[PDB]
């Protein structure tokens with residue numbers, strides 16, 4: 001069991017003062033094997049007196065669940081509640097006792113009778129189980145209750161311990177694409193640490209400008225690896241650092257930072273992993289991944305001119321820049337590129353990086369799409385990212401026409417005891 | 428825009444001939460009192476009022492994806508249907524570009540408008556320039572306008588033709604000079620950026636019809652101004668609810684109550700029942716005579732109720748809207764079912780309808796002060812992707828409600844879903860298609 | 876503050892060797908700029924501005940050789 005492995009690793013660490021002895025311990029390797037075998041999953045969540053919802057218990061499937069409903073049926077509230085729960089888990093994982101987002105005053109029900117709001121959730125890791133309760137009382141109400149975070153902190157501890165000894169340890173992906181992805185994130189008119197991608201980046205999506213620099217760096221590394229001719233690249237970077245230091249001897253903080261960057265470049269060149277999933281292979285996989293969703297186009301290239309880089313796409317017989325695409329292809333290009341970027345950054349050890357685990361929440365999947373695209377997007381996403389759990393809300397009947405019976409959830413309003421209540425039913 | 432010696436030509440009733448006749452008359456008489464009573468001014472006013480504003484036809488050459496194309500638009504409603512990448516938005520931007528020069532020349536003459544962006548020219552090798560042209564018909568008066576731009580790197584020049592717009596705008600400025608509350612046409616554009624216009628300083632005290640003419644598009648601060656305008660209307664009603672109107676309220680009701688109780692009482696010169704009835708009749712006659720303007724609390728209470736009921740027409744699930752004055756600040760309270768809701772707590776779909784209808788009502792009221800019912804004003808409205816954040820139940824009735832509420836406004840709408848297409852007449856449907864002709868791909872428009 | 880500090884040099888009656896030292900510093904800055912141009916735009920801009928200021932100060936020293944109103948006279 002996970003608890004048995006954790007206890008064994010703790011005892012071995014306590015007994016083995018030497019770091020090498022702890023690294024060679026069979027308990028740590030077994031724990032890593034159990035963690036890799038386990039798949040992230042969220043079995044259920046209970047909502048009490050949150051927004052319109054008064055009392056609800058929901059169970060989610062492992063692969064995909066889709067909620068269909070009209071306007072005003074609480075589809076967005078479910079997504080907000082799940083993002084609320086995931087916020088505390090992320091904060092605890094990132095650093096010790098990090099405070100998380102709380103329930104706002106206006107979130108509680110407007111009914112006079114209700115006095116407090118509570119959200120409960122349960123997370124299952126293969127055989128392990130954990131739960132978390134977050135609660136906030138109404139304004140001007142006494143007998144305040146305090147949230148319980150022991151279960152989540154016990155999940156964060158095993159991840160921090162596992163990642164402390166192994167620098168290639170994977171992490172679960174937590175992302176939440178709200179409606180805000182359509183304003184300017186879809187548009188383009190506006191060393192990298194893997195820790196910043198997951199822990200230091202919130203679930204909401206705002207700007208994709210970083211994606212461009214990341215692609216530029218990936219292309220530069222791929223070009224250097226493919227063209228070779230680097231010779232002593234580490235020595236060349238060290239000589240550049242020495243030249244910078246000599247110039248400094250012959251703004252000061254920036255120069256020192258640039259010298260440290262040159263030393264980091266020399267160390268990176270000296271390392272030279274040259275793994276099977278090299279830069280050229282990742283570049284090809286990313287481009288072919290995006291091109292899979294846009295059958296009309298032919299190829300995508302990064303053209304360098306005027307001391308800058310620009311993206312060139314070929315459609316039919318006309319080459320277009322990034323800013324000349326329509327809104328529809330802008331949305332898909334932005335969302336898919338952001339999906340792949342986090343998977344690559346979070347899983348640098350797997351041979352095929354598009355196999356990590358995680359949970360994704362998407363709202364209004366049918367924004368700016370014609371029915372022909374709307375009839376094949378779900379299967380495309382499921383095939384592209386197999387080991388990821390998706391939660392999607394939609395109301396277009398075209399989307400519903402291609403979904404299995406067991407994965408749908410229909411919300412209804414029923415008057416019981418003279419009070420309107422929300423119910424969830426399966427076909 | 429010239430005085431001219433009024434060349435006789437042949438007899439006609441064109442609006443332009445009346446404009447020249449008035450200009451010729453003005454150059455001689457100096458007393459403004461005689462000018463304000465001249466028959467020529469009356470003829471010009473009548474001709475301008477009878478004419479109905481509507482665009483006629485449009486053509487596009489080498490602009491964005493479209494290579495060569497010409498469309499004719501209906502006078503009441505037209506809908507464009509197509510998939511992604513067929514230039515549904517391009518047509519709307521072309522119309523906005525053309526209309527901007529007309530907007531600019533009304534505020535002040537010889538003022539530039541919107542040009543063509545350098546990246547909007549077609550990307551083909553053999554292209555050299557792009558052009559957009561359009562025609563506006565005022566019943567029997569025809570104007571045309573051309574906008575063009577040459578591709579960067581070429582060494583051959585092109586110019587714009589702005590005689591028609593300058594001449595047409597001069598008529599509007601001239602009539603506005605001699606009329607206290609002359610109306611103006613309505614022009615608006617609701618792009619795809621309106622989703623977070625409602626989705627997301629020095630206090631204003633003076634309003635004017637030119638405030639809506641600053642920009643042709645709807646975005647950001649316009650929403651804020653709507654809130655500041657709404658509270659201004661509410662206080663205007665409250666001021667008129669007090670004063671002498673309350674005096675007639677007290678006298679007429681009490682006297683009527685005095686009669687009613689006696690009839691109900693049937694207690695026992697015939698007392699003073701006849702005198703009381705005579706006093707009630709005199710009070711009612713005085714109250715009826717005291718009415719002025721719209722005769723229903725002037726035009727303030729009726730305007731506020733008209734706006735509220737117009738908004739409530741699109742949201743049947745709600746009961747009433749009220750403007751509670753919070754101690755810190757004002758706030759608006761709705762009511763859905765048995766619950767009281769705040770505007771920040773509304774769903775995305777209801778927010779979009781709230782902003783769209785409120786903005787249209789504000790613009791129409793501001794531009795048409797003399798009309799008894801301001802909603803009848805003429806103009807042109809452009810809307811993109813009417814099916815945003817709306818479930819199919821609401822998709823089937825939005826079009827007829829929009830047309831019925833504003834009957835004299837020309838609508839141009841682009842859609843994406845077949846639910847709307849189920850409730851549109853064949854006459855007002857245009858379908859975009861892609862056809863490769865002579866080895867070159869091109870776009871066509873086909874009637875159903 | 877700047878005027879008082881400049882008048883301090885006049886009070887000290889510094890000779891032309893100070894101008895030579897400033898010229899040497901300017902030459903060293905120019906060499907550093909040349910090294911920077913080879914294999915930091917803000918640093919280049921700051922170095923260019925400092926070089927221009929040093930050249931202006933050297934021209935002020937030349938005008939001092941040509942003589943001008945003393946900073947002491949302006950101060951009082």
Ligand SMILES: Nc1ncnc2c1ncn2[C@@H]1O[C@H](COP(=O)(O)OP(=O)(O)OP(=O)(O)O)[C@@H](O)[C@H]1O
Pocket residue numbers: 051052070071072073074075076077078106107108109110111763766768772773774775776
């Ligand atoms: N505090 C509250 N008390 C009672 N009802 C509320 C409260 N807050 C919101 N509501 C109700 O929630 C309804 C839906 O708003 P909400 O923000 O939950 O959107 P939604 O139904 O989840 O979204 P979507 O239409 O995108 O699916 C509103 O019609 C409103 O009456």
Ligand SMILES: Nc1ncnc2c1ncn2[C@@H]1O[C@H](COP(=O)(O)OP(=O)(O)OP(=O)(O)O)[C@@H](O)[C@H]1O
Pocket residue numbers: 315318320324325326327328491492510511512513514515516517518546547548549550551811
């Ligand atoms: N300079 C250009 N040269 C060639 N094609 C261009 C150029 N600029 C834009 N396009 C074309 O414009 C198309 C998009 O046009 P547009 O945005 O009007 O269509 P749409 O998808 O119907 O609109 P919307 O989704 O914004 O309502 C792209 O497919 C692109 O090929």
